[PDB]
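tl;dr need the bound structure. longer version: we got a ligand (magnesium ion) that a collaborator sent over and nobodys looked at where it sits. i said id run it. heres the input, straight from their email, havent touched it
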Amino acid sequence: AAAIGIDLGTTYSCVGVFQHGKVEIIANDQGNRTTPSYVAFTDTERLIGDAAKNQVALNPQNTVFDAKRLIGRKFGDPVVQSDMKHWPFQVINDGDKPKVQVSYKGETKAFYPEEISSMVLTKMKEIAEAYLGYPVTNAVITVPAYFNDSQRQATKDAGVIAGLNVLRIINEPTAAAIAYGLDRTGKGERNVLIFDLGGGTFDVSILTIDDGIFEVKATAGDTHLGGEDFDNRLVNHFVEEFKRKHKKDISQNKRAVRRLRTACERAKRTLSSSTQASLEIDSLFEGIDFYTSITRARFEELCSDLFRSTLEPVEKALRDAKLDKAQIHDLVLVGGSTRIPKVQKLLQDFFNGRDLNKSINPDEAVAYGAAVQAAILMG
Amino acid sequence: STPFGLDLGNNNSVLAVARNRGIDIVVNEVSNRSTPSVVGFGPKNRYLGETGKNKQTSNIKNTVANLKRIIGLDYHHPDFEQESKHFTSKLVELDDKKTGAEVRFAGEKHVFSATQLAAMFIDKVKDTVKQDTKANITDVCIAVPPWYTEEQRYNIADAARIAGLNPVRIVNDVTAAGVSYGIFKTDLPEGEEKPRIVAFVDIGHSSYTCSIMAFKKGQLKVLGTACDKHFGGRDFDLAITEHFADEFKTKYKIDIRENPKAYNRILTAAEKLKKVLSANTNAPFSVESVMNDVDVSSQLSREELEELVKPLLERVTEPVTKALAQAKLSAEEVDFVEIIGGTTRIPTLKQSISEAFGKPLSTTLNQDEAIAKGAAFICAIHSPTLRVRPFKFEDIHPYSVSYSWDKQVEDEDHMEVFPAGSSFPSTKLITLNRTGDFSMAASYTDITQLPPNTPEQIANWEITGVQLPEGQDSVPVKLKLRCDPSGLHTIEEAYTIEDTKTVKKDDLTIVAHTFGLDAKKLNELIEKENEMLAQDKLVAETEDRKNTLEEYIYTLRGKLEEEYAPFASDAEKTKLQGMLNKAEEWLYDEGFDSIKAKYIAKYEELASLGNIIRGRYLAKEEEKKQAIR
Ligand SMILES: Nc1ncnc2c1ncn2[C@@H]1O[C@H](COP(=O)(O)OP(=O)(O)OP(=O)(O)O)[C@@H](O)[C@H]1O
Ligand SMILES: [Mg+2]
């Protein structure tokens, strides 16, 4: 029987398994290679994964996500207090342990964070078991580098609840580094920086590796970046265009903005793989067609401050590590936003042309390394 | 050269390659593990794959999807309409009575055959692979549906040739999935042991295939195969769209059937709703501005969806029952049922397949990758530089095939050569007494066993160079009749014998007339493809040189203001800002749509001065590092 690697993500999870000399990332029964870390409670049932995320807007008080933010934390944690203001679900105090409170089958129920995460882990276990065709009972689970003993232990408890034997809790950037084989270089100290940007979260980690042994040298989280701010720049740019060509302002038109916005989100995505993108919205405002385009270079320019700001945590992490940028040996990119060419450019131009580890899907590189490490721990 | 397998799907295509000690999935320019099977056309260039898809909703009239489905399609085929209803572009009859797409492209009206169109896509997808692999790719194995006709297999093989590839084998797709099953499972029965019986069910965008196979270590045989070519995800999307078409007439007083663009918006949204319904039991349906100013907001339950496709689901067990009857077995004799294809994620289908086999479903293959991986393994089997672990497989030959010959001195003028329900590939050796040059042909022994309107004749041959010996009566000609690994009916050798001893005398020349194209026609089509490729490439490179210019303007402007500031005189800075400003304004005027050379020229004026400042900046950087070390 094979061991599995699980990235228990704050928003999405991912499971892999090492088989026949390679890591296989396993698709769930809907065909998706990541599964939302969502757990929904309803009048009749419990839904986990895609089913849970699919009905969030119709059942927002009873659809739990972000349990990773609560796990291993005290209720009076300033982070817990801060975060509560952003969730549409209730979090209660029970002995100074946070619990998410919910309507489930016509009853009021509270759950520990590790109980919500265990249900996500049961899901990843079932995904792995359906693919392999046998019971899976051994897992490496990953956590962020900044996790404390309690956060680490609470995650292991979630594993144990899911029925897993947690072989090891490993750091996410460690996992990403193992994915790229950076632990194989033998004796001698190597500085690796993992740049993890995607899903509105940003973590820079510097690790030192020596004889396959990892040490966390620095972590730096600029916490919120990669979303609606880029969308707004594009929206404002095009609102201006329309104002210029047709001499009319669309700013104070609620539906038209959401429409032009949808167009800009699409266009943005296209520009990660193309140097230009067309926008074409039928009768956008007062019966007037808005067919235009934007170049990649123009998009980057509109958002140049928003892009440059990604190097702040890099420069911070370097300081805490007490390292010059010239002392970093290897770069690893994780998280969806690292697909953005400008992100890759900025990083490379900052690090003087140094090559980037980026060939593994940046959403999958952590589950990948965890799956590698799970097979090592069984061999 | 690296073996390349192609799962050419109606909706998406999967790319796999055989390298290192294994087989890898090739990822596209957008990093996707499949590429949309779309050929679109614009005023300047073609939109192929991902870009085709990106442009699709804005140019539906000039975007062809359903590429697979129009290969070898008679324009007046009794079931043309089941094909054409899924097209958004203009279809037209070709000179051979087949169907092409008419399209506005580069400012003119263009007609392309299904072969040409499929070649364009194969060529794009070939480029993805050699940009990923850095390698030379010359050979493909293409996976097709088992219902593909002999003609259709020749057609798609010619499509590969127009894309500059050698179609090393055209493989049945779930045979390719079964091969990838076989090469990856490590516990297969080994000797006198009963083989493992595994049924494979593939339901995709357009087709539903059941194929039942016997496995031992290093081998498979296909026992039974049945298809419904009119059962797929696209039929669910369409039933959902038609349901909402009716609903919106009463609810919103709008008629989306009279508005192709509106209709297409609903169709697109209907697939997303269908997928939600594989996970959830109810789903809202919300589409903003389906027309001018009109937002629709409705819903659908899984049970309502299941009712919508009731007429389709009446046929849900047929490919299973048909594949078992062919295999000459009962459902209980199947050990495992493996499920692949996107449409098998639908709960009603899963229950129906499970119930028809009396077994739980297995999912130990990646459903999306299995066919492409098997196709890449099969492509490797064909490389002269052999380094694959061998795997033997035989596929089913559903129809009886006879060969005929100029009678002459033979008592018979035909015989059954390849029986109904035998295997391919297969070679049959015959010797015939001959009075001179002669014709031959291959045909279906019983045409009633074939699809409606199937011509009986498969191929014919003109065999010449026959010379009679001294006793000028007859002479024995030895023939090699081959159903090749693609299941194609060939003659691959003919020679005169009888030069106390038997001996070859004269090697006879064979002229073949098949569904394959002439070398003259092949080269003409290869030419057209090369021209379109050059045009696409010119446009892609000029768009790149211009985005590179615009980026450098912004980048060098910011650097002059920051880290380059100490490294430029006032005269150097203001000169360069002036030309930066002027280059930016040019990109809105004459440079809005200029030529490659001018984007390069403009960049070189700027960079030639910018590099001088950079080279001062870099010098003091290195200097500070000597003050370090
Ligand atoms: N979770 C899901 N639930 C329902 N349908 C799905 C799901 N995922 C994918 N599909 C459908 O599966 C189809 C794509 O499947 P697939 O890749 O097997 O087709 P294909 O190979 O392109 O088509 P074909 O084999 O007919 O040429 C699409 O219609 C898609 O909507
Ligand atoms: Mg398919």
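gonna send this back to them w/ a short note. The domain at 1-37+114-185+363-386 of chain B is CATH 3.30.420.40 (Nucleotidyltransferase; domain 5).
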